[PDB]
Design a protein around this ligand. Structure first.
Ligand SMILES: *[C@@H]1O[C@H](CO)[C@@H](O)[C@H](O)[C@H]1NC(C)=O
Ligand SMILES: *[C@@H]1O[C@H](CO)[C@@H](O)[C@H](O)[C@H]1NC(C)=O
Ligand SMILES: *[C@@H]1O[C@H](CO)[C@@H](O)[C@H](O)[C@H]1NC(C)=O
Ligand SMILES: *[C@@H]1O[C@H](CO)[C@@H](O)[C@H](O)[C@H]1NC(C)=O
Ligand SMILES: *[C@@H]1O[C@H](CO)[C@@H](O)[C@H](O)[C@H]1NC(C)=O
Length: 479
């Protein structure tokens, strides 16, 4: 069975309509199970759509709008699950399939095998030249309760096209009262297994056209075989060798390539508040999100953090590169249209736990007394250095304390904390405890005199170790 992903384009199309067609063929040709939506929009009159015969099932919605072809060749389409709906209303939407001043438009629907719409409504409207679809009993299909040709005599006034072989096959409204679902005839012995969607060829869960829920090796089951199965004799949950994950309406021993396991299911990526581990576990800290720093990938050409790039750092926990704050970044670039940074926007770094390169503070908003926006920064990697330095805090008159409360590791490079005239606490810090290697040293010069700090009461809390503090209070200790 061949699987593919849908589109989430709705009415949008490529301006070159031949390209809209090539995209359609590319996305859906040779695909049997659409994991998502089937959107056929803005397709011209003389186009070969016969490749749509590969499709047996759509999980999302089927959208057919603004097209101009005569026939819709979806003859193998058995089921629309309607997991996602068009405008959150329709599983099947067929409209405006005509072009003005040209007797070009949709004439008939090749949907003879379409007998199941699990969720959503049906919307068939304003198709100038569409015939027969008005004779269809959508009540049988949907599980939730101009001058045209005539249906063939045998079709009993319900058909998709004009011949004896275009009749609508009813699989629910023609059943015996006893049936849990669909049927293949009108007798009591003709009921399908309750797990059969579309209909069936016999009474077993292996005789279905499609599955109501999941398909476990040809059998239509309520749920996939679990990791542990109860044993009524031994009274224990025995390990199930047949255990399978859910991949849409399939039960799989192995998820497709690069997919993750979220609560027994195969997903493209972990949901919000969950993290990859390949399984999805709830987040230990703030969910991991690696970001490019100044001079890396997306920010290769960037020189400082500024108003035009600040937002690229929203929810980042790890910075791949550096974090650089220059005068042009803090105070704005008059030589361009780059205005000064909203100092409140620097709060965006409160999610950052790691910086792989260096932290270079050449400028800081003069009303910010500290670096508490970096309160959760655990590591400075120093994988790349600024003249041997991995931490540079230079010439800040506005700063009073550091307040890097989570800073536990400076993996490489030296420290340069200089000419910060009003800065205290720095002298209480035993930098050694943060350094990973012998060569790592500190340049400390012309900050507030340690004696004047003490006299003014800028001292570590009693709870702090001999290692010192980043600022005042008992939340600022090194150990
Ligand atoms: C429609 O469904 C039947 C039953 O699953 C299958 O045999 C057939 O290939 C599809 N039918 C047509 C008429 O294309
Ligand atoms: C279930 O999967 C089997 C593969 O073992 C496939 O051939 C068949 O079409 C599926 N059955 C239904 C009813 O979807
Ligand atoms: C950042 O994550 C929060 C939840 O932690 C979410 O509210 C927000 O929309 C995310 N911001 C962006 C720009 O994606
Ligand atoms: C710091 O000053 C700026 C303007 O220079 C303003 O955005 C900000 O709100 C101040 N921070 C406060 C009041 O917490
Ligand atoms: C500490 O305090 C004194 C006295 O008020 C002042 O001269 C200066 O800020 C400090 N001393 C030195 C040598 O910087």
């Amino acid at each position: 069975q061949s699987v593919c992903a849908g589109t989430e384009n709705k009415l949008s199309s490529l301006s070159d309509l031949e390209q809209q067609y090539r995209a359609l063929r590319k996305y859906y040709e040779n695909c049997e199970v659409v994991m998502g939506n089937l959107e056929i929009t803005s397709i011209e009159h003389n186009r070969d759509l016969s490749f749509l015969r590969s499709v047996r099932e759509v999980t999302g919605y089927v959208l057919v709008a603004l097209n101009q072809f005569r026939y819709l060749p979806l003859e193998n389409l058995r089921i629309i699950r309607g997991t996602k709906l068009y405008e959150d209303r329709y599983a099947l939407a067929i409209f405006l399939n005509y072009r003005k001043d040209g007797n070009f438009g949709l004439q008939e629907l090749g949907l003879k095998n379409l007998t199941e719409i699990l969720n959503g409504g049906v919307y068939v409207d304003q198709n100038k030249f569409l015939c027969y679809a008005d004779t269809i009993h959508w009540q049988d299909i949907v599980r939730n309760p101009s001058g045209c040709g005539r249906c063939h005599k045998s079709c009993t006034g319900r058909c998709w096209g004009p011949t004896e072989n275009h009749c609508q096959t009813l699989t629910r409204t023609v059943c015996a009262e006893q049936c849990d679902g669909r049927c293949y005839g009108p007798y009591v012995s003709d009921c399908c297994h309750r797990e059969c969607a579309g209909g069936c060829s016999g009474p077993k869960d292996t005789d279905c056209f499609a599955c109501m829920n999941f398909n476990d090796s040809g059998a239509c089951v309520t749920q996939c075989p679990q990791t542990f199965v109860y044993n009524p004799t031994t009274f224990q949950l025995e390990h199930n060798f047949n255990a399978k994950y859910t991949y849409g309406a399939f039960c799989v021993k192995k998820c497709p390539h690069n997919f993750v396991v979220d609560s027994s299911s195969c997903v493209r990526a972990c949901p919000s508040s969950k993290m990859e581990v390949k399984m999805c576990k709830p987040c230990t800290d703030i969910c991991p999100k690696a970001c490019d720093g100044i001079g890396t990938g997306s920010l290769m050409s960037a020189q400082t953090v500024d108003s035009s790039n600040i937002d690229k750092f929203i929810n980042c926990t790890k910075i791949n590169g550096n974090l650089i704050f220059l005068v042009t970044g803090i105070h704005g670039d008059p030589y361009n249209a780059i205005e000064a940074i909203d100092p409140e926007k620097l709060n965006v770094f409160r999610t950052v736990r790691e910086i792989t390169g260096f932290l270079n503070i050449q400028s800081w908003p003069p009303n910010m007394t500290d670096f508490s926006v970096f309160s959760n920064l655990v590591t400075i990697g120093g994988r790349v250095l600024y003249s041997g330095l991995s931490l540079l805090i230079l010439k800040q008159q506005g700063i009073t304390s550091l307040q890097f409360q989570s800073l536990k590791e400076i993996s490489a490079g030296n420290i340069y904390i200089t000419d910060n005239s009003n800065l205290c606490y720095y002298h209480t810090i035993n930098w050694t405890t943060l350094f990973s290697t012998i060569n790592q040293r500190i340049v400390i010069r012309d900050n507030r005199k340690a004696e004047n700090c003490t006299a003014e009461g800028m001292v570590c809390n009693h709870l702090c170790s001999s290692d010192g503090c980043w600022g005042p209070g008992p939340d600022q200790c090194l150990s």
